[PDB]
C-alpha cells in the first residue's frame, strides 16, 4: 500500500474500454494495470472503495462500491474481466450509467469521488449527444473525471470536453498499454492528492 494513499478517503471507479481498438492481449495489459493500481491503494469500506466496470455498447459491472469483499477477492474479479472487444465502445452510455446508477446520491461527502475513465476508442456521433451534459452533471455532483487515452484512436474530442469544464479534471494520453506500467506511479500521485486525509 502507498505511503501517500493510506490515510486517504476516496471512491474510485474503473471504466474499462471494451472496443476492438485494443486486442485481447492489449486488454490483458489494461487489466494488469488496474490490478497493480489497486495493490498500492488501501482497499477498504472506511478508506478506499473500488468499482470495476467494463464498458462497450453498454456497461458490465463486475465490482460495486458497496461490495463487502476482501481486497484479494476484488483483485481476482478485476483480473478475470472477460474480453468483449465490441465494435463500439460508447463512452456516453458508461457515463450516463456512472451519473445515475453509481453516483445517484452523496453517501461519502467526506471523501473524494473519482471516475477513472479508460478510453482508447471513439463512439459514433449519434451517441455523443448528451456527453457534455453528463460531464457537467458529474461536476455538480462533485466528481473528478479523469480521461485515460490509450493509442491514436482515443476520442481526443471527448478528452478536451472534460478537461475544459473543471480544473481538477486532468487527462492521461498514452500511446500504448505498455505506458500504463510507466505512469502507474504518477496517476496515483494525482488520484490520492485529490482525496482528503483522516485525523
Amino acid at each position: 500500500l502507498h505511503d501517500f494513499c493510506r490515510s486517504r478517503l476516496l471512491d474510485l471507479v474503473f471504466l474499462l474500454d471494451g472496443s476492438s481498438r485494443l486486442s485481447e492481449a492489449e486488454f490483458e495489459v489494461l487489466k494488469a494495470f488496474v490490478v497493480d493500481m489497486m495493490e498500492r491503494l488501501r482497499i477498504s469500506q472506511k478508506w478506499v472503495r473500488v468499482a470495476v466496470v467494463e464498458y462497450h455498447d453498454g456497461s458490465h459491472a463486475y465490482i460495486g462500491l458497496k461490495d463487502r469483499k476482501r481486497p484479494s477477492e476484488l483483485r481476482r474479479i478485476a483480473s478475470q474481466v472477460k474480453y468483449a472487444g465490441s465494435q463500439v465502445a460508447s463512452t456516453s452510455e458508461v457515463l450516463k450509467y456512472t451519473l445515475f446508477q453509481i453516483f445517484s446520491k452523496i453517501d461519502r461527502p467526506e471523501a473524494s469521488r473519482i471516475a477513472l475513465l479508460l478510453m482508447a476508442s471513439q463512439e459514433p456521433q449519434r451517441m455523443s449527444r448528451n456527453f457534455v451534459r453528463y460531464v457537467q452533471g458529474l461536476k455538480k455532483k462533485k466528481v473528478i473525471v479523469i480521461p485515460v487515452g490509450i493509442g491514436p484512436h482515443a476520442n481526443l474530442k471527448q478528452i478536451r470536453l472534460i478537461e475544459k469544464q473543471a480544473p481538477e479534471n486532468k487527462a492521461f494520453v498514452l500511446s500504448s498499454v505498455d505506458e500504463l506500467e510507466q505512469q502507474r506511479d504518477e496517476i496515483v500521485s494525482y488520484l490520492c492528492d485529490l482525496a482528503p486525509e483522516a485525523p
Binding site: 453498454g58 456497461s59 458490465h60 450509467y97 445515475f100 445517484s104 467526506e110
Partner: protein
C-alpha cells in the same frame, strides 16, 4: 467484545454482521450513525429499540429472515433502511416512524399485496426497491406522498396490471425497473411528458393490439432510454436495447415496430 466499533471521520460505524445475533446487543454506543446487522437470526424486530441512538441515519437488516418488523417509536434522522432478502409477508408502515427516510430497500421478500397509503408520510423518500416479491396489483396513489422519488424498482414480480397515475407527481424519476413481470399493456398517458433516462420494460408479455399504440409512440421517441438488465453470476450488465420490448404474439417482434393495423 463481539461487535466492531470504528471511528471514521466524525461519525461512528458499528459492524455486527454474521454473529448469530438473535436480538440487539447490549452496551452499544449512543453516538452511532451507521449500524450493520447483516445476516443474523432475527425472528422479529422493533425500531423502538434503536431510539436511544439519535445519531443513527443508516440501518441494515438484510438477510435476517425477518418475518415481522414492528414500527414503534420514532427515528427523526434515519434516512436509509435495508430489509432485503427476508420473510416479510406484509409491508410495515414507515410513514409515522421514519420521516427523514430517503432510501428504502425491501427487495426479494414475499409481499403478496400493498395496503392503501403504504408510503404516506415519506415526503423525503427518493428510492423504493420492491424487486423479487409477488406484487400482482398496486394501490391507487401509491407514490403520491413521495414526489421526490428518483428510483422505483418493481422488477421480478407478478404484476399483470398497472395504475395509470403511478408516475404522477414524479419530476425527479430517472430509473424505472419493470422487467420480469406479467404485464400485457401500458395505460394511456402513463409516462406523461417527463423525460425518463432509464426504463426497463423487457421480459414482459406485451399484448400488441390497439391499446398498445401509446406505448409504441413512447418507445419511438424514447428508444435511447430503454435499457436491459441482464445478470451472469455476480456480473450485472445494463445495455440499451429498445428491441427488447417484444410482443407476446410469438414472433419475437419488437413492440415499437408493431404496425397499427385496423386501429384508429
Amino acid at each position: 467484545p463481539i461487535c466492531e466499533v470504528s471511528k471514521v471521520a466524525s461519525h461512528l460505524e458499528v459492524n455486527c454482521d454474521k454473529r448469530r445475533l438473535t436480538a440487539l446487543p447490549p452496551d452499544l454506543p449512543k453516538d452511532t450513525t451507521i449500524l450493520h446487522l447483516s445476516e443474523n437470526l432475527l425472528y422479529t424486530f422493533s425500531l423502538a429499540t434503536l431510539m436511544p441512538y439519535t445519531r443513527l441515519t443508516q440501518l441494515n437488516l438484510d438477510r435476517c429472515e425477518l418475518t415481522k418488523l414492528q414500527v414503534d417509536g420514532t427515528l427523526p434522522v434515519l434516512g436509509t433502511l435495508d430489509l432485503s432478502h427476508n420473510q416479510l409477508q406484509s409491508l410495515p408502515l414507515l410513514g409515522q416512524t421514519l420521516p427523514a427516510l430517503t432510501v428504502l430497500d425491501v427487495s426479494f421478500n414475499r409481499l403478496t399485496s400493498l395496503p392503501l397509503g403504504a408510503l404516506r408520510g415519506l415526503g423525503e423518500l427518493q428510492e423504493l426497491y420492491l424487486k423479487g416479491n409477488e406484487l400482482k396489483t398496486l394501490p391507487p396513489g401509491l407514490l403520491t406522498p413521495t414526489p421526490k422519488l428518483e428510483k422505483l424498482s418493481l422488477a421480478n414480480n407478478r404484476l399483470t396490471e398497472l395504475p395509470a397515475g403511478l408516475l404522477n407527481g414524479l419530476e425527479n424519476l430517472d430509473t424505472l425497473l419493470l422487467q420480469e413481470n406479467s404485464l400485457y399493456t401500458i395505460p394511456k398517458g402513463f409516462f406523461g411528458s417527463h423525460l425518463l433516462p432509464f426504463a426497463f420494460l423487457h421480459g414482459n408479455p406485451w399484448l400488441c393490439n390497439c391499446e398498445i399504440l401509446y406505448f409504441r409512440r413512447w418507445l419511438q421517441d424514447n428508444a435511447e432510454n430503454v435499457y436491459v438488465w441482464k445478470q451472469v453470476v455476480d456480473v450485472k450488465a445494463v445495455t440499451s436495447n429498445v428491441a427488447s420490448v417484444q410482443c407476446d404474439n410469438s414472433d419475437k417482434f419488437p413492440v415499437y415496430k408493431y404496425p397499427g393495423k385496423g386501429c384508429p
